[PDB]
Scaffold this active site. Sequence first.
Site, PDB file in Angstrom:
ATOM      1  CD  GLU A 156      -2.578  -1.326   2.965  1.00  0.00           C
ATOM      2  OE1 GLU A 156      -1.889  -0.815   3.594  1.00  0.00           O
ATOM      3  OE2 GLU A 156      -3.470  -2.224   3.031  1.00  0.00           O
TER       4      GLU A 156
ATOM      5  CG  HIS B  60      -0.316   1.202  -6.214  1.00  0.00           C
ATOM      6  ND1 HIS B  60       0.227   0.871  -6.827  1.00  0.00           N
ATOM      7  CD2 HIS B  60      -1.540   2.001  -5.721  1.00  0.00           C
ATOM      8  CE1 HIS B  60      -1.177   1.067  -7.969  1.00  0.00           C
ATOM      9  NE2 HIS B  60      -1.815   1.784  -7.365  1.00  0.00           N
TER      10      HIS B  60
ATOM     11  CG  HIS C 255      -7.867   3.590 -13.672  1.00  0.00           C
ATOM     12  ND1 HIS C 255      -7.313   2.528 -13.526  1.00  0.00           N
ATOM     13  CD2 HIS C 255      -7.796   4.455 -12.559  1.00  0.00           C
ATOM     14  CE1 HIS C 255      -6.573   2.747 -12.530  1.00  0.00           C
ATOM     15  NE2 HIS C 255      -5.909   4.382 -12.634  1.00  0.00           N
TER      16      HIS C 255
ATOM     17  CG  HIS D 281     -12.713 -11.751 -19.588  1.00  0.00           C
ATOM     18  ND1 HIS D 281     -12.135 -10.567 -19.987  1.00  0.00           N
ATOM     19  CD2 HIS D 281     -11.808 -12.251 -18.487  1.00  0.00           C
ATOM     20  CE1 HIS D 281     -10.319 -10.258 -19.394  1.00  0.00           C
ATOM     21  NE2 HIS D 281      -9.803 -11.471 -18.830  1.00  0.00           N
TER      22      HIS D 281
ATOM     23  CG  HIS E 134      -4.759 -12.274 -15.433  1.00  0.00           C
ATOM     24  ND1 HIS E 134      -4.896 -12.832 -16.298  1.00  0.00           N
ATOM     25  CD2 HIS E 134      -6.242 -11.341 -15.635  1.00  0.00           C
ATOM     26  CE1 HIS E 134      -5.709 -12.836 -17.100  1.00  0.00           C
ATOM     27  NE2 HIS E 134      -6.584 -12.042 -16.809  1.00  0.00           N
TER      28      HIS E 134
HETATM   29  C1  HEM Z   1      -5.841 -14.475 -22.588  1.00  0.00           C
HETATM   30  C2  HEM Z   1      -6.671 -13.563 -22.506  1.00  0.00           C
HETATM   31  C3  HEM Z   1      -6.623 -12.512 -22.126  1.00  0.00           C
HETATM   32  C4  HEM Z   1      -6.273 -11.710 -21.603  1.00  0.00           C
HETATM   33  C5  HEM Z   1      -5.698  -9.963 -22.276  1.00  0.00           C
HETATM   34  C6  HEM Z   1      -7.184 -10.419 -20.280  1.00  0.00           C
HETATM   35  C7  HEM Z   1      -7.068  -9.257 -19.683  1.00  0.00           C
HETATM   36  C8  HEM Z   1      -7.927  -8.364 -18.592  1.00  0.00           C
HETATM   37  C9  HEM Z   1      -7.736  -7.565 -17.478  1.00  0.00           C
HETATM   38  C10 HEM Z   1      -6.757  -5.983 -18.644  1.00  0.00           C
HETATM   39  C11 HEM Z   1      -8.200  -7.463 -16.605  1.00  0.00           C
HETATM   40  C12 HEM Z   1      -8.696  -6.312 -15.666  1.00  0.00           C
HETATM   41  C13 HEM Z   1      -7.315  -6.798 -14.516  1.00  0.00           C
HETATM   42  C14 HEM Z   1      -8.406  -5.569 -13.131  1.00  0.00           C
HETATM   43  O1  HEM Z   1      -9.008  -4.571 -13.675  1.00  0.00           O
HETATM   44  O2  HEM Z   1      -7.158  -5.447 -12.205  1.00  0.00           O
HETATM   45  C15 HEM Z   1      -8.207  -9.105 -15.960  1.00  0.00           C
HETATM   46  C16 HEM Z   1      -9.776  -9.345 -15.189  1.00  0.00           C
HETATM   47  C17 HEM Z   1     -10.084 -10.670 -15.046  1.00  0.00           C
HETATM   48  N1  HEM Z   1      -9.750 -11.952 -15.917  1.00  0.00           N
HETATM   49 FE1  HEM Z   1      -8.365 -11.806 -17.723  1.00  0.00          FE
HETATM   50  N2  HEM Z   1      -7.533 -11.774 -19.203  1.00  0.00           N
HETATM   51  C18 HEM Z   1      -7.516 -12.760 -20.573  1.00  0.00           C
HETATM   52  C19 HEM Z   1      -8.079 -14.062 -20.212  1.00  0.00           C
HETATM   53  C20 HEM Z   1      -8.659 -14.417 -19.240  1.00  0.00           C
HETATM   54  C21 HEM Z   1      -8.918 -16.290 -19.182  1.00  0.00           C
HETATM   55  C22 HEM Z   1      -8.402 -17.539 -19.485  1.00  0.00           C
HETATM   56  C23 HEM Z   1     -10.032 -16.077 -17.561  1.00  0.00           C
HETATM   57  C24 HEM Z   1     -10.469 -16.995 -16.353  1.00  0.00           C
HETATM   58  C25 HEM Z   1     -10.566 -18.619 -17.101  1.00  0.00           C
HETATM   59  C26 HEM Z   1      -9.714 -14.794 -16.605  1.00  0.00           C
HETATM   60  C27 HEM Z   1     -10.073 -14.243 -16.029  1.00  0.00           C
HETATM   61  C28 HEM Z   1      -9.941 -12.913 -15.067  1.00  0.00           C
HETATM   62  C29 HEM Z   1     -10.715 -12.063 -13.887  1.00  0.00           C
HETATM   63  C30 HEM Z   1     -11.495 -13.842 -13.175  1.00  0.00           C
HETATM   64  C31 HEM Z   1     -11.071 -11.169 -13.589  1.00  0.00           C
HETATM   65  C32 HEM Z   1     -10.867 -10.788 -12.687  1.00  0.00           C
HETATM   66  C33 HEM Z   1     -10.197 -10.789 -11.688  1.00  0.00           C
HETATM   67  C34 HEM Z   1      -9.555  -9.443 -10.431  1.00  0.00           C
HETATM   68  O3  HEM Z   1     -11.124  -8.975  -9.950  1.00  0.00           O
HETATM   69  O4  HEM Z   1      -8.921  -8.492 -10.444  1.00  0.00           O
HETATM   70  N3  HEM Z   1      -8.392 -13.914 -17.878  1.00  0.00           N
HETATM   71  N4  HEM Z   1      -7.749  -9.468 -17.848  1.00  0.00           N
END
Ligand code: HEM
EC number: 1.17.99.9
Length: 309
Positions: A63, A66, A129, A222, A284
């Site tokens: 914290e 950041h 954002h 998503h 991620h």
């Molecule tokens: C491969 C291409 C993918 C890209 C470019 C991508 C991109 C992103 C981005 C930019 C976020 C926002 C993070 C934030 O705001 O902190 C996100 C969140 C998330 N992604 Fe992906 N994603 C991809 C694949 C996946 C896959 C395959 C899964 C799951 C099966 C997944 C599950 C999630 C989940 C659960 C979140 C929300 C996490 C949170 O609450 O902080 N994503 N993703």
Amino acid sequence: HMLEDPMNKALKALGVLTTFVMLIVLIGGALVTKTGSGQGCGRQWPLCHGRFFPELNPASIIEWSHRFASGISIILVLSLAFWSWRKITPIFRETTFLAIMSIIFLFLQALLGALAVVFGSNALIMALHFGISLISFASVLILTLLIFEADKSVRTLVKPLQIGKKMQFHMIGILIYSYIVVYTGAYVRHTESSLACPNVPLCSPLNNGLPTQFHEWVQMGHRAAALLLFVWIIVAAVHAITSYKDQKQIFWGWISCLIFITLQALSGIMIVYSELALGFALAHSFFIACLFGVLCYFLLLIARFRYES
Ligand code: HEM
Ligand SMILES: [Cu+2]
């Protein structure tokens, strides 16, 4: 190396430092709350401002680091923008667009973050954002790249490559679509649809693995969006492997994109399986930062090629 003023290698150091700080501001947001009154606090315990007695915890460091990175960013970005503009522009005309882009988006994310303190309930707006923060980082990253290239006679990455129309389609198309997938991801987060589907690739054991509720649709949308991006990148990489084997920047550039897309998907699956362990959350945000950086590098190549030819 170069008999020129030693202060020049300090502009390279500033570039590296700022790129790094901007990356921290971005991926660090995966560990702290970005909305509401608990903003800035570790996501797992939104209360860090006020009441608590204890101090020097590993979560307190996050914290502090950041908020520190976010504060120091204004100083660093403005200095890098100015200095590089003054020094690098003679060789790279693109320097000015980048300097400007860096400043504008640093302010945009700061503006959106400020508003998130009180309008964080608007997931559609809040989901904007990340992409803004991402461009803030990518702008500084590419500017830093030009700062280094400006000091080399045989450039390593910023070379005048011949980009065919198809490759240009893939590069620009994937860049734009990746930004869209980034929005859907951010939308899942700020809409709290992260864990609506315990299974992967499908939603859950019920309803045949298909979404039947709001949060499941967001989650599933998503994943679906991500799959298309993944497939496109495979097609783009195959075209590079076949037709750009002689242009290594493009050949390896896409291979790394292929690897980053894989790590992005895997860390995405792990977020779900681990039920949002922030370590996977952090991963991620990081891999998409790498992939987007490479895509922005490609955009610079096209921008220069279109100017040259
Ligand atoms: C491969 C291409 C993918 C890209 C470019 C991508 C991109 C992103 C981005 C930019 C976020 C926002 C993070 C934030 O705001 O902190 C996100 C969140 C998330 N992604 Fe992906 N994603 C991809 C694949 C996946 C896959 C395959 C899964 C799951 C099966 C997944 C599950 C999630 C989940 C659960 C979140 C929300 C996490 C949170 O609450 O902080 N994503 N993703
Ligand atoms: Cu709900």
